[PDB]
Structures are given as structure tokens and as C-alpha cells.
Amino acid sequence: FPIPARQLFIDGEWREPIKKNRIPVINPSTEEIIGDIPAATAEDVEVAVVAARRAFRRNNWSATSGAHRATYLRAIAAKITEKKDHFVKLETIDSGKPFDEAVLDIDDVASCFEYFAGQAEALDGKQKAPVTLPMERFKSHVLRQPLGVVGLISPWNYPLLMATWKIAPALAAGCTAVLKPSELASVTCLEFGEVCNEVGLPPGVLNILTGLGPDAGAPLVSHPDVDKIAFTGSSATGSKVMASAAQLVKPVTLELGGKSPIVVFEDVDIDKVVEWTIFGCFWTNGQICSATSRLLVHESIAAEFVDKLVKWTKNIKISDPFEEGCRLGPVISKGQYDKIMKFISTAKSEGATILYGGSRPEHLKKGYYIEPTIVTDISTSMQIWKEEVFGPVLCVKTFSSEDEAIALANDTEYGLAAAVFSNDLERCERITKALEVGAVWVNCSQPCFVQAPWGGIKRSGFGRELGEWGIQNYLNIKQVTQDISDEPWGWYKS
Amino acid sequence: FPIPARQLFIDGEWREPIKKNRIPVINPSTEEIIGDIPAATAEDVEVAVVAARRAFRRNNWSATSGAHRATYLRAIAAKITEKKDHFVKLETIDSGKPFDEAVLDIDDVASCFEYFAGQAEALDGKQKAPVTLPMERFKSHVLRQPLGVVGLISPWNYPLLMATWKIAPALAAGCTAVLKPSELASVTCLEFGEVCNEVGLPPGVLNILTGLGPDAGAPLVSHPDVDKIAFTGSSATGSKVMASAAQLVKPVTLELGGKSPIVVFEDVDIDKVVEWTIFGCFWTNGQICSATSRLLVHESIAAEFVDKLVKWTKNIKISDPFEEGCRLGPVISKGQYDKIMKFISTAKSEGATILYGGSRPEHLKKGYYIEPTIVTDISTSMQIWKEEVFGPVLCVKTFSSEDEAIALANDTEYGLAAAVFSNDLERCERITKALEVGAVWVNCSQPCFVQAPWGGIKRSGFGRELGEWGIQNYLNIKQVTQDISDEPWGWYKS
Ligand SMILES: NC(=O)c1ccc[n+]([C@@H]2O[C@H](COP(=O)([O-])OP(=O)(O)OC[C@H]3O[C@@H](n4cnc5c(N)ncnc54)[C@H](O)[C@@H]3O)[C@@H](O)[C@H]2O)c1
Ligand SMILES: NC(=O)c1ccc[n+]([C@@H]2O[C@H](COP(=O)([O-])OP(=O)(O)OC[C@H]3O[C@@H](n4cnc5c(N)ncnc54)[C@H](O)[C@@H]3O)[C@@H](O)[C@H]2O)c1
Ligand SMILES: [K+]
Ligand SMILES: [K+]
Ligand SMILES: [K+]
Ligand SMILES: [K+]
């Protein structure tokens, strides 16, 4: 199909980068440039935040009720469901993710807006919520207002979904925003610009700057009229954006991925659990923030599990994303390809065993394809064990004791997610409690519902997006307390 | 009487600074070194966090229930009420604040712990709160666990109260902590160490390092095993601590004070409001984070308000804090004294009018005493208008329009509090909504109840302490979602 030429979406209309630079979009499956995106620069950020600030000042969006903004949200969700086919295809060719996965993404963005429409609606009538004071002299309630203009910065692994994880709560709260999506996957996001016009979003309420991290994002976060930054990306980058935000004591939420464990005890149906473990580390082509990329399996089932494991993954149709039956596409880019490949090299070099994969597929001669990979004979000292690979690469180690599974699981600087498998539920509760982590899956891995709070701890960052926590990141919690006594304070003397 | 010659509180017992350095405590009223406090250094921070981390690992505090910790809280509150007299004294000589104010502080710390004892109790049964998912296949709830070891850093303007604003929620949540109080007011806080032993707090659950900001606090915030920082202080310092915390993507709450407006409309009994305006800017000797230090009064009552104003403040007994009837003490320190004085000089120099005070009192010949000060003929360009003075110094400007009051009030980079006076309540609501601020007082100024969320926006920082928000800053909000179907995910092929 025809990717589209598209431009910068600023103040409801399409604008050209002030420096007129652009960058390639590239099919991960063909290595071929299949198109073009604007390359926003600091000067574009300036006009964008200005539009956003102006839009915020209008008595047209921000001081509006939640129920009012919920209709635009509900409408956006509807529009997306309508142009479904169109989005899911664009997302498959831009991301390199299996077409079947992309269908889920797009259903999920629709569903996300609809959940936050609800949130915005519940925002009303949280307003002026009373707080009880001791005195009778004073009365007090809470207002929940938009913080103002917010910068949203998202990753390429679920282009539109990750972006709406930010857009939906931001808009629900009454903020205006500047979105800067990954330079590795901007098309659906740019295409979102039209959707806004089609649903009648006031101009400047959502602005979309595509471009490189350093050129477009950095200026977004350091801008003096952006009140809050919502960042999702690597921990290394997180640190950078938080330091920049610190200059202006600007609030920040950081979702930074990790090195999440999946611990499997003896008492499990090793055929399903095996299916998850594959899901937890290979799906989305291994590019999952919460990827359960470290398997801690009991020595008991150790061999067998791993056997069925290699069998199942051996079972995965690695092909071009559009090809029917495709359960695994190419990684996002040449750079990522190289990085993942190097992680593999230095893992051999460090003395681990590539008990499957670790190489290009075979049937695929072009495109950034990499075979689901299982590596064993692991030391907790090796790089592969500590570093997030963000490719289809799984590490295996075994354990004797329960609290050795525990110690071994918590043995990272990261702390995003974890998955524990066992039919002994009193054992499951005990493990979920002990995991130094923000999300614990019990007898599954990766299911992420918009109803539930989502974020990490430790190097994985802080703050919770989604659920009933999402909208809160974009609000000014305002206390108002008034004197109803009409008597003098009586502290001083007249 | 004699002060409290203490040492550092670490792991339940009194330890000496590893570098054995100490610093003077000084009565603001006598300029006289009346004592001595330990001067913690980075090496002390090391042993302190270690104690804290160990204490957190003990199945003795952190994995305990909220109701269990609530008793230590309730006990601490009791002990403080018991040793009331002793604390309020020590506070008065350490802070230079009027004895009557100190009295209040100490009642407030007691009350604060009790409120958070309640919070910790409510924490239970929020545990495993269910979140409803669409699919029947999955069940989900939320756990609320302590983040781990937290560093708490507080200011001198309410030595123990400001510290318990952090200690109480931290302990209620199940965290262990290292407290680093201001070097300008550490005695009560050091004395709190004993209270803990007396109520049986496990060792290492609360540690207290006194010392200088750069020597004791900086190492506390940059330490690799401190999971979260709660900071209250100047915006300039806030920026530094957040930049440091960014190194390790460490969560942070920042309460940074401001330049809060008090806007008074024509329709008010200008004797009651006048008393507040004095309270809002001169109480605590002008050293209030939320100090309503900018008066925007309607030209109508302008003259007369200001008249009764000068009259009232002219009526304020400025004397030694212990002297009965004392409504105004010395500022905290020589350095603060100098800073406040300079603000006055450069305000003269910039062309403002010192319509009262601006100088040392007469009857007081020693001690850091400064007259309640009223300054007029203000330009929004002058330093006195923008910069937080943190002394008993009030600026006055007048307004014609309502939305001129509004524009003029929002005319700062800060955004902590604001106070609006008017018997027209429809007008009040309108103004409270428009104020770019975190707390809006209606027909009063400064009343801060532990029941209500407290914090700022803009340069005043972010996050809310106290109320139902307080405890939240010290929790890991953990999602747990489990598969109850027993069926295969069914995404791949066996
Ligand atoms: N916890 C989560 O919610 C979550 C979800 C998915 C992915 N992730 C993480 O996302 C990462 C992959 O995404 P990525 O490669 O796009 O991450 P990244 O760190 O490169 O950056 C993500 C976004 O930040 C922008 N950016 C980069 N440098 C910037 C700078 N200096 N200033 C401002 N913005 C800048 C990027 O261009 C991109 O839009 C993985 O590490 C994964 O762990 C986290
Ligand atoms: N917003 C609020 O809730 C609130 C409440 C009270 C006071 N305040 C503000 O507090 C300020 C006055 O307090 P202050 O003089 O103590 O502020 P400050 O910034 O000088 O320092 C405050 C605390 O931080 C420590 N500190 C200093 N430098 C540090 C560093 N580099 N790293 C780590 N810690 C460091 C100090 O020792 C002190 O204990 C005012 O600006 C006032 O508005 C705000
Ligand atoms: K791409
Ligand atoms: K963290
Ligand atoms: K002192
Ligand atoms: K801010």
C-alpha cells in the first residue's frame, strides 16, 4: 500500500517542519524505505507548545466538564474502530509486528479511549469532594483540574497504543498536549492527527511532532511552558529526561521497561505454562517492556519443560508479518537488529549456551529477522542476564529452594513485571508479595488490561499509568478550604 | 535550662559521626551558641541506610499489617503529648518562633501521627482491592506495599511538624527511613530519637542524621539503596535534589514554597481580613511556605485597609519568644537575617516604599529581630514582588478589575497557595478556580489541616502530602492479575 506523505500536526492543521527536514520510514521485513516522516526540530516544538498553551487558555476545552471531553474521547474510539483495517495494516508495516498482533493493538486503542471517556466522566462529581476538618470554623473540598500543557513521549513497540496510553488520560483530564512518538514508528500516530480533525477536537488540544529523540523530544521536555512530562522508553533515556525536567522542577512519570522474571514451580501443566513463557518473551518479536525474559524453572521439571519449550518455539512461524499464520516478524530496525545480535555474540563469548536460535532464520534472506532464542548455562554475572535485550531472547536458570527463586528473581536493578507459575496458590500469593516489582502475573504472563494500574519500581521507573491511576498524573489536586464563621481569627490584638 | 546534647540516631542507638564533626545550635533571640549537634557526613549516611535496609528486610515491620504499625504511631503520638512541655520549649528556643506558636506545632505533630495511624489502618482492606476485567479468564486486584527505604529531608520553620509530615506517612506505609532535618533546627528531631526507643520502634526503622545540606542530605538523596526521596525546601534546592535523584530514576516529591497572593475584594469586613493578612505573612516570623506575601487589594478599600493594616501590625508584640504575650520572634539565623535585610535594601533601591518597618526593632538590641514590614508602590518588575523573602515582609498592590486581580495573582513562577477574601461567594468560587495554585483559602489564610492534600504546582513543585494522599507517596502500587481458566492461551500452535 501507499504509506502516506504526511506532515506535522500542529494546531489542528498540517504544518511543515521549520527546517523542512524529514526521515525515512522503513519496512523491517524488506529493509526498504517505504516512506517519509517530518523531522520536527526545537523550533517546531515552540510553535506546538504555543498552540497547546493557547488552546488550554480557551474556555473551550480545559475548563470544560469531563462528560464533555468524554464525547470526543468516545468519538475518537468510534472513528478508530471504523478505520480499523486501515490502521492495523499501517501498523503492521511500520512496526514489523505480526498482523494478528496489530489487530489487537488497534482494538486496544479504541478500548483505551472508551475506558478514559469513563474516567473523564467519573472526574465530574469527584469535583468538590468534601474533606472533613476538626474545627467547625472551616470547610474543605478537593478540586481536580488539568495541570495545563503536557509533553507525551512514547516508544515504537506499540506505536498507537503506547501513544493513546498517554493521549487518553491527558485529554480526559482537561490538559492539552504535544505528542512525540518514536522516530522508528510514527505513521499511525501521524495518521491520528486526521482522526482528531474528523471528531472535531479543538485545534491545539493535541499536537503531533514526529522526529528524533534528541531533536524533537529533548526540546519538548526542557521547554519552559510544558508543565508535565509523561515518558515511556529506556531507563537510560528516562534518567536523561528526568534530569532535564529537574531544571524546572517539572513533574514526570517514567515507564522504563526491565528484565522481568518468570518463575515456574514443579506443580504446573508444563504445556500451557510453556506457551506463556514463549508469549512472555517472544511475542511482539521480543520487544516487550514487561518481557518475562528470565526463566527460573525448578530443576525438577527443568529438563522436559525446556524440551517442550524448544519444541514449542521451534513451532513458531517466523515470516513476513502480513503472511497469514505469521507468529513472529522482524525486529523494528537495523540498529535494534545489530544490538540484539551483539547481545547474542557476547553471550556466547561469555560462555552461555545458545540451546536454540541465536542466528538469522534461513528462509528469510532480507529484513531484520532473528530466531526465537533460548540460552542456558547462565551465570548471574553475564550481561545477557542483567541487560534488557528487547529481542526474542530468553535466558534460563534453575532453582532448588522457593526463596532461591525469590532471591534470583529480585536479582536485578529493574522492577517492572514478574510472572509466577504454580497450582499451589498459597505459594503464588507468597511469591507475588515478595517480588520487587510493579506488576505480578499469577499463572500467565503479559496480559495488560487498561482497567489496572501499570508501572514499575527500581530502575523500571515510577508512577502508574492506566486504570484509575492514569488520569491522576495529569491533574492538579487543588485543596480549597474556607472560613464559614465570619468571626475574627483572634490570634492577634486590635 | 540546658539543651539536649545528643548524638546521631542510627539502628535504635546513639552513634557518633564517623568524622566526629559537630555544629552549633544558636538561639535566634540571643545570637548565643546554646548547644551542639552532630554533623553527619556521607559515611554516616552509609551506615544509616544499611540499618534501614536491614530493618526493612526483617519480617518485623515492613511485611507487618497497617493496624500493627498504627499502634507504634498511636504510641508515638501519646508520648509526644506526654512530653509536650519539654518539646514545645526546645522548639521555641531552637526556632525562634513565639512560644504560643510552638505550642501549636507540638499538638499538631501528635495529631499528625494519629491521623496517619488511621491511614495505616485503612491501608489494610485496601489490600487486594479488586479491579474488574472484561475477560472472565482473568482476575485482578491491587496490593499496596512499602517502596522500601526512603530518605526524608525537611526544613527548620516547623522542625518537628515538617519532619512528622514525612515520618508518619512513611512509617504508616511500611517503609523504613532516614530523616535529615535542617541544620538550623535539629534538637526536637534528635530528641524524637528517644521517643522511638521509648515506644519500641524496631531499630533501623527510623534513623536520624543531623548535619549540613551538602554533607548529609546530598549523600542521602544520591545513595543507590534509597528507593524514594521526600523533600521539602527551597525551589532552588528542589531542582538540585531532583537532578541527583534522576541519576537513578528515583521517585521524588517536592514541596518548594512560593510567593502566594492574597486578594481582597471591596465587600469584606476589613478588620477580620486584615487580621488574616497579618497571619498569612507575619506569623511564624514570616517564614511560611504558603505565606500570602503579596496583597492584591481593591483600590476601593485600598486606603483604610492598609491603614487598619499598619495599625494592626503596629500592634504586634515583637519580643523574645518566651516572653508572655510574644506575637513575633527573631528570624531563624544570621544568614536569613542578612538575606531578609538585603531584600529590604534592594527594594528601597528599586524604588518601592517602606510604608512601615524595614528595619531592626528598637527595644531589641541583640538577636535576629526584624520588624513586620509593609511595602507599597510596587512594580511587578521588582525583586521583592517575584522572590520569596521568607521574612515578615508583605508587598501591596491594588487592582481595578476582577480578572486583573486574577492575572496579577497568577503572575509568578510559583504556585503553592493563595487566599481570596470576599463575601460574594460566587465570586470566591470563580477566583479559587482560576488561581494557578495547589491550595486556595477562601476568607482565611494559612490554615493547614492534616486531613487535606497539600502541595504546589509550577515552581512550587509537585506531589501532595498529608490527607489521603500522604501515605500514597510511600507505596508500591502492585497490580496482580491471574489466569483462572486453566485453558491454554491459544495464541500459538502446539
Ligand atoms: N513500562 C512501560 O510502560 C514500557 C512499555 C513499553 C516499552 N517500554 C520501554 O521502551 C523502550 C523501547 O522504546 P524506545 O526504543 O523508543 O525507547 P527510547 O528510550 O529510545 O525513547 C522512547 C521515546 O523517547 C524519545 N526520546 C529519546 N531520547 C530523548 C531525549 N533525549 N529527550 C526526549 N525524548 C527522547 C524517543 O525518541 C522515543 O519517542 C524499552 O526499553 C522498553 O523497556 C516501557
Ligand atoms: N511547600 C511546602 O510544603 C513547604 C513547607 C515548608 C517550607 N517550604 C519552603 O522551604 C524553604 C525554606 O526551608 P529551607 O531553608 O530549609 O530550605 P533549603 O532548600 O535550604 O534546605 C532544606 C532542607 O534540605 C536540605 N538540603 C539542602 N541542600 C541539599 C542538597 N543539596 N541535597 C540534599 N538536601 C539538601 C537542607 O539541609 C535542609 O534540611 C522555603 O523556600 C519555603 O517556602 C515549603
Ligand atoms: K519503522
Ligand atoms: K525508582
Ligand atoms: K537554631
Ligand atoms: K512543576
PDB file of C-alpha atoms in Angstrom, chain A residues 100-101 104 128 131-135 138 142 144-145 235 239 242-243 246-247 249-251 254 256 272 275-276 278-279 283 312 315-316 327 429 432-433 435-444 447 449 451-454 457 461-462 464 469 476-483 486-494, chain B residues 57 100-101 104 128 131-135 138 142 144-145 235 238-239 242-243 246-247 249-251 254 256 272 275-276 278-279 283 312 315 327 429 432-433 435 437-444 447 449 451-454 457 461-462 464 469 476-483 486-494:
ATOM      1  CA  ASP A 100      -2.578 -10.639  14.152  1.00  0.00           C
ATOM      2  CA  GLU A 101      -0.853  -8.721  16.955  1.00  0.00           C
ATOM      3  CA  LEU A 104      -5.175  -6.469  18.972  1.00  0.00           C
ATOM      4  CA  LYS A 128     -15.693  19.473  45.181  1.00  0.00           C
ATOM      5  CA  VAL A 131     -12.773  16.621  53.258  1.00  0.00           C
ATOM      6  CA  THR A 132     -13.815  16.707  56.912  1.00  0.00           C
ATOM      7  CA  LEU A 133     -11.950  19.097  59.201  1.00  0.00           C
ATOM      8  CA  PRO A 134     -11.971  19.034  63.023  1.00  0.00           C
ATOM      9  CA  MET A 135     -12.938  22.638  63.544  1.00  0.00           C
ATOM     10  CA  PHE A 138     -13.539  25.702  58.331  1.00  0.00           C
ATOM     11  CA  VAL A 142     -10.942  18.998  46.591  1.00  0.00           C
ATOM     12  CA  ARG A 144      -9.271  18.185  40.299  1.00  0.00           C
ATOM     13  CA  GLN A 145      -8.119  20.396  37.451  1.00  0.00           C
ATOM     14  CA  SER A 235      15.806   3.536  31.646  1.00  0.00           C
ATOM     15  CA  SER A 239      17.306   9.304  33.521  1.00  0.00           C
ATOM     16  CA  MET A 242      14.166  13.386  34.338  1.00  0.00           C
ATOM     17  CA  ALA A 243      17.413  15.360  34.762  1.00  0.00           C
ATOM     18  CA  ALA A 246      14.607  18.755  37.071  1.00  0.00           C
ATOM     19  CA  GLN A 247      15.909  22.117  35.817  1.00  0.00           C
ATOM     20  CA  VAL A 249      11.163  21.161  38.840  1.00  0.00           C
ATOM     21  CA  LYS A 250       8.724  19.676  36.346  1.00  0.00           C
ATOM     22  CA  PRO A 251       6.675  16.603  37.307  1.00  0.00           C
ATOM     23  CA  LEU A 254       8.668   7.269  33.918  1.00  0.00           C
ATOM     24  CA  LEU A 256      11.225   2.275  31.663  1.00  0.00           C
ATOM     25  CA  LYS A 272       0.405 -24.246  28.870  1.00  0.00           C
ATOM     26  CA  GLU A 275       3.015 -21.405  25.909  1.00  0.00           C
ATOM     27  CA  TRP A 276       3.027 -18.342  28.081  1.00  0.00           C
ATOM     28  CA  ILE A 278       7.004 -18.080  24.846  1.00  0.00           C
ATOM     29  CA  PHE A 279       4.351 -15.358  24.852  1.00  0.00           C
ATOM     30  CA  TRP A 283       5.615 -12.112  21.224  1.00  0.00           C
ATOM     31  CA  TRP A 312       7.007 -25.038  21.008  1.00  0.00           C
ATOM     32  CA  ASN A 315       6.865 -24.435  16.348  1.00  0.00           C
ATOM     33  CA  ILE A 316       6.634 -20.658  15.757  1.00  0.00           C
ATOM     34  CA  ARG A 327       3.532 -15.617  14.626  1.00  0.00           C
ATOM     35  CA  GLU A 429       0.420 -15.327  46.875  1.00  0.00           C
ATOM     36  CA  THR A 432       3.689 -12.224  44.374  1.00  0.00           C
ATOM     37  CA  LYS A 433       4.140 -10.492  47.706  1.00  0.00           C
ATOM     38  CA  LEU A 435       8.586  -9.839  44.078  1.00  0.00           C
ATOM     39  CA  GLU A 436      10.273  -6.407  43.942  1.00  0.00           C
ATOM     40  CA  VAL A 437       8.056  -5.383  41.072  1.00  0.00           C
ATOM     41  CA  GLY A 438       5.112  -3.244  39.938  1.00  0.00           C
ATOM     42  CA  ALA A 439       3.066  -5.963  38.211  1.00  0.00           C
ATOM     43  CA  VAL A 440       2.876  -9.663  39.161  1.00  0.00           C
ATOM     44  CA  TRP A 441       1.164 -12.198  36.853  1.00  0.00           C
ATOM     45  CA  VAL A 442      -0.062 -15.417  38.523  1.00  0.00           C
ATOM     46  CA  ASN A 443      -0.220 -18.400  36.125  1.00  0.00           C
ATOM     47  CA  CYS A 444       0.081 -16.275  32.985  1.00  0.00           C
ATOM     48  CA  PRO A 447      -1.864  -9.681  29.891  1.00  0.00           C
ATOM     49  CA  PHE A 449      -5.620  -4.558  30.881  1.00  0.00           C
ATOM     50  CA  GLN A 451      -8.515  -1.393  33.948  1.00  0.00           C
ATOM     51  CA  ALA A 452      -5.427  -1.979  36.120  1.00  0.00           C
ATOM     52  CA  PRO A 453      -2.654   0.347  37.322  1.00  0.00           C
ATOM     53  CA  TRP A 454       0.568  -0.081  35.311  1.00  0.00           C
ATOM     54  CA  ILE A 457       9.796   0.358  40.666  1.00  0.00           C
ATOM     55  CA  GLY A 461      10.846   3.920  36.964  1.00  0.00           C
ATOM     56  CA  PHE A 462       7.825   5.214  38.886  1.00  0.00           C
ATOM     57  CA  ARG A 464       1.274   4.300  37.484  1.00  0.00           C
ATOM     58  CA  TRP A 469      -4.322   5.962  38.333  1.00  0.00           C
ATOM     59  CA  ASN A 476      -3.687  19.472  39.785  1.00  0.00           C
ATOM     60  CA  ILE A 477      -5.121  18.234  43.048  1.00  0.00           C
ATOM     61  CA  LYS A 478      -6.364  21.561  44.437  1.00  0.00           C
ATOM     62  CA  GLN A 479      -7.357  21.945  48.076  1.00  0.00           C
ATOM     63  CA  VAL A 480      -9.881  24.642  48.823  1.00  0.00           C
ATOM     64  CA  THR A 481     -10.742  25.378  52.440  1.00  0.00           C
ATOM     65  CA  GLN A 482     -12.916  28.284  53.534  1.00  0.00           C
ATOM     66  CA  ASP A 483     -13.811  30.061  56.744  1.00  0.00           C
ATOM     67  CA  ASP A 486     -17.334  35.256  59.953  1.00  0.00           C
ATOM     68  CA  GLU A 487     -15.594  35.697  63.301  1.00  0.00           C
ATOM     69  CA  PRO A 488     -12.089  37.190  63.676  1.00  0.00           C
ATOM     70  CA  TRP A 489      -9.211  34.721  63.631  1.00  0.00           C
ATOM     71  CA  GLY A 490      -8.462  36.031  67.139  1.00  0.00           C
ATOM     72  CA  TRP A 491      -4.723  35.390  67.147  1.00  0.00           C
ATOM     73  CA  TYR A 492      -3.517  38.997  67.192  1.00  0.00           C
ATOM     74  CA  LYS A 493      -4.669  42.199  69.015  1.00  0.00           C
ATOM     75  CA  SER A 494      -6.559  45.238  67.608  1.00  0.00           C
TER      76      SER A 494
ATOM     77  CA  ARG B  57      14.199  -6.882  55.320  1.00  0.00           C
ATOM     78  CA  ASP B 100       2.401  30.163  71.637  1.00  0.00           C
ATOM     79  CA  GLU B 101       3.085  29.054  68.056  1.00  0.00           C
ATOM     80  CA  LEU B 104       0.592  24.521  68.389  1.00  0.00           C
ATOM     81  CA  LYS B 128      -6.304  -6.981  47.426  1.00  0.00           C
ATOM     82  CA  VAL B 131     -10.249  -4.428  39.703  1.00  0.00           C
ATOM     83  CA  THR B 132     -12.815  -5.699  37.220  1.00  0.00           C
ATOM     84  CA  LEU B 133     -11.534  -7.031  33.902  1.00  0.00           C
ATOM     85  CA  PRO B 134     -13.612  -7.634  30.742  1.00  0.00           C
ATOM     86  CA  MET B 135     -12.471 -11.242  30.158  1.00  0.00           C
ATOM     87  CA  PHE B 138      -8.550 -13.164  34.276  1.00  0.00           C
ATOM     88  CA  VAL B 142      -4.206  -4.290  43.821  1.00  0.00           C
ATOM     89  CA  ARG B 144      -0.231  -1.607  48.330  1.00  0.00           C
ATOM     90  CA  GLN B 145       3.249  -2.309  49.684  1.00  0.00           C
ATOM     91  CA  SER B 235      12.789  25.577  44.828  1.00  0.00           C
ATOM     92  CA  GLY B 238      14.457  21.140  44.989  1.00  0.00           C
ATOM     93  CA  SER B 239      15.871  21.328  41.500  1.00  0.00           C
ATOM     94  CA  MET B 242      15.587  16.126  41.706  1.00  0.00           C
ATOM     95  CA  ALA B 243      18.528  16.240  39.324  1.00  0.00           C
ATOM     96  CA  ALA B 246      17.338  11.459  38.288  1.00  0.00           C
ATOM     97  CA  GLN B 247      20.732   9.680  38.121  1.00  0.00           C
ATOM     98  CA  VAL B 249      15.443   7.361  38.206  1.00  0.00           C
ATOM     99  CA  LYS B 250      14.435   7.643  41.865  1.00  0.00           C
ATOM    100  CA  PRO B 251      10.880   8.889  42.684  1.00  0.00           C
ATOM    101  CA  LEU B 254       8.937  18.237  46.075  1.00  0.00           C
ATOM    102  CA  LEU B 256       9.099  24.086  47.492  1.00  0.00           C
ATOM    103  CA  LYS B 272     -11.145  40.381  60.234  1.00  0.00           C
ATOM    104  CA  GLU B 275      -6.005  40.084  60.855  1.00  0.00           C
ATOM    105  CA  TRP B 276      -5.630  37.201  58.447  1.00  0.00           C
ATOM    106  CA  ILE B 278      -1.080  39.662  59.026  1.00  0.00           C
ATOM    107  CA  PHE B 279      -1.306  35.993  59.954  1.00  0.00           C
ATOM    108  CA  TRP B 283       3.176  34.535  61.561  1.00  0.00           C
ATOM    109  CA  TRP B 312      -2.794  46.041  63.439  1.00  0.00           C
ATOM    110  CA  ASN B 315       0.052  46.327  67.457  1.00  0.00           C
ATOM    111  CA  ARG B 327       3.426  37.513  68.900  1.00  0.00           C
ATOM    112  CA  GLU B 429     -15.588  30.104  43.720  1.00  0.00           C
ATOM    113  CA  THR B 432     -10.456  29.729  43.507  1.00  0.00           C
ATOM    114  CA  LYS B 433     -10.897  28.003  40.196  1.00  0.00           C
ATOM    115  CA  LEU B 435      -5.776  30.515  40.769  1.00  0.00           C
ATOM    116  CA  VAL B 437      -2.135  27.062  42.726  1.00  0.00           C
ATOM    117  CA  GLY B 438      -2.308  23.908  44.838  1.00  0.00           C
ATOM    118  CA  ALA B 439      -4.209  25.318  47.824  1.00  0.00           C
ATOM    119  CA  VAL B 440      -6.804  28.100  47.819  1.00  0.00           C
ATOM    120  CA  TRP B 441      -8.064  29.630  51.082  1.00  0.00           C
ATOM    121  CA  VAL B 442     -11.498  31.314  50.946  1.00  0.00           C
ATOM    122  CA  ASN B 443     -11.945  34.088  53.554  1.00  0.00           C
ATOM    123  CA  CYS B 444      -8.930  32.998  55.605  1.00  0.00           C
ATOM    124  CA  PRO B 447      -4.983  27.094  57.979  1.00  0.00           C
ATOM    125  CA  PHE B 449      -5.169  20.646  58.242  1.00  0.00           C
ATOM    126  CA  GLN B 451      -6.963  15.957  56.671  1.00  0.00           C
ATOM    127  CA  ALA B 452      -6.445  17.777  53.350  1.00  0.00           C
ATOM    128  CA  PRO B 453      -3.989  17.149  50.477  1.00  0.00           C
ATOM    129  CA  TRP B 454      -1.079  19.616  50.486  1.00  0.00           C
ATOM    130  CA  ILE B 457       2.326  23.363  41.107  1.00  0.00           C
ATOM    131  CA  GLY B 461       6.914  21.624  42.998  1.00  0.00           C
ATOM    132  CA  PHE B 462       4.608  18.612  42.753  1.00  0.00           C
ATOM    133  CA  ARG B 464       0.598  16.050  47.540  1.00  0.00           C
ATOM    134  CA  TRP B 469      -2.587  11.408  49.503  1.00  0.00           C
ATOM    135  CA  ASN B 476       4.376   0.460  45.572  1.00  0.00           C
ATOM    136  CA  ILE B 477       1.002   0.121  43.870  1.00  0.00           C
ATOM    137  CA  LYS B 478       1.304  -3.507  42.739  1.00  0.00           C
ATOM    138  CA  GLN B 479      -1.047  -4.993  40.188  1.00  0.00           C
ATOM    139  CA  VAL B 480      -1.638  -8.724  40.391  1.00  0.00           C
ATOM    140  CA  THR B 481      -3.732 -10.380  37.725  1.00  0.00           C
ATOM    141  CA  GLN B 482      -4.155 -14.145  37.473  1.00  0.00           C
ATOM    142  CA  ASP B 483      -5.483 -16.647  34.974  1.00  0.00           C
ATOM    143  CA  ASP B 486      -6.861 -23.476  33.240  1.00  0.00           C
ATOM    144  CA  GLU B 487      -7.078 -23.338  29.454  1.00  0.00           C
ATOM    145  CA  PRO B 488      -4.193 -22.728  27.041  1.00  0.00           C
ATOM    146  CA  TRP B 489      -3.640 -19.111  25.975  1.00  0.00           C
ATOM    147  CA  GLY B 490      -4.290 -20.390  22.449  1.00  0.00           C
ATOM    148  CA  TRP B 491      -2.198 -17.813  20.600  1.00  0.00           C
ATOM    149  CA  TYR B 492       0.469 -20.178  19.278  1.00  0.00           C
ATOM    150  CA  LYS B 493       0.487 -23.696  17.865  1.00  0.00           C
ATOM    151  CA  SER B 494       1.433 -26.875  19.638  1.00  0.00           C
TER     152      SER B 494
END
